[PDB]
Amino acid sequence: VRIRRAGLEDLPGVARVLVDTWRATYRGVVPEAFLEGLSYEGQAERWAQRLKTPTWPGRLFVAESESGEVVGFAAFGPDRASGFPGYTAELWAIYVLPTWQRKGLGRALFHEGARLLQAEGYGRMLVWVLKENPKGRGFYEHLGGVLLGEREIELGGAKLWEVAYGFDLGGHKW
Numbered sequence: 001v002r003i004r005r006a007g008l009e010d011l012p013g014v015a016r017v018l019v020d021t022w023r024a025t026y027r028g029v030v031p032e033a034f035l036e037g038l039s040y041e042g043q044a045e046r047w048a049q050r051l052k053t054p055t056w057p058g059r060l061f062v063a064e065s066e067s068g069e070v071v072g073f074a075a076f077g078p079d080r081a082s083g084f085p086g087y088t089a090e091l092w093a094i095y096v097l098p099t100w101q102r103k104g105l106g107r108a109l110f111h112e113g114a115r116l117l118q119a120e121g122y123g124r125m126l127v128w129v130l131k132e133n134p135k136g137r138g139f140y141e142h143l144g145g146v147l148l149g150e151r152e153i154e155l156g157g158a159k160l161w162e163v164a165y166g167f168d169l170g171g172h173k174w
């Protein structure tokens with residue numbers, strides 16, 4: 001239903017959306033061991049430390065169900081040294097619980113963050129997504145993202161490919 005900035009009380013819910021969607025989306029792509037390892041508590045604490053840090057440049061958003069549960073979230077911030085001059089912002093994470101997907105929540109989250117990054121003066125934003133994640137890829141391609149590059153990372157013990165999509169913030173109306 002609605003999108004808003006996250007508060008500290010929203011984090012336990014943010015952590016569940018994160019872990020549950022990671023588990024549902026990366027089955028057979030990211031090692032089972034690693035996926036089983038994710039922690040609701042660990043995740044909630046990590047975001048909590050960030051939210052509590054006054055100088056943290058990250059921006060957090062959550063998507064609410066009709067009754068108010070946190071069923072989606074998105075984090076935006078400065079790029080994390082991706083090596084693409086001209087791309088100063090990055091979509092750190094965006095996840096919507098499987099059953100709440102394809103109802104416009106991801107788009108709404110995306111637009112809210114891009115709007116804020118635009119107001120903060122970032123010219124362009126990129127996003128990294130697993131080469132083997134059709135869901136996220138299809139979503140970004142549909143939204144206009146242009147393929148920028150790729151890199152191999154290692155999650156769990158697995159070496160995996162990741163691709164980047166670029167989006168224009170300046171000038172565009174989000």
Ligand SMILES: CC(=O)SCCNC(=O)CCNC(=O)[C@H](O)C(C)(C)COP(=O)(O)OP(=O)(O)OC[C@H]1O[C@@H](n2cnc3c(N)ncnc32)[C@H](O)[C@@H]1OP(=O)(O)O
Pocket residue numbers: 021025091092093094095096097100101102103104105106107108127128129130133134135136137138139142143
């Ligand atoms: C940010 C990094 O972590 S990359 C990882 C991204 N997260 C994941 O892959 C986790 C699994 N997936 C999800 O959480 C969600 O599906 C997301 C975040 C990828 C997308 O959010 P959703 O709410 O499902 O998409 P939403 O309903 O807002 O779709 C918006 C538009 O994109 C289109 N779209 C969304 N996904 C796809 C897709 N996979 N293929 C083609 N089109 C798509 C929708 O049809 C819609 O089109 P429309 O505006 O013309 O009607």
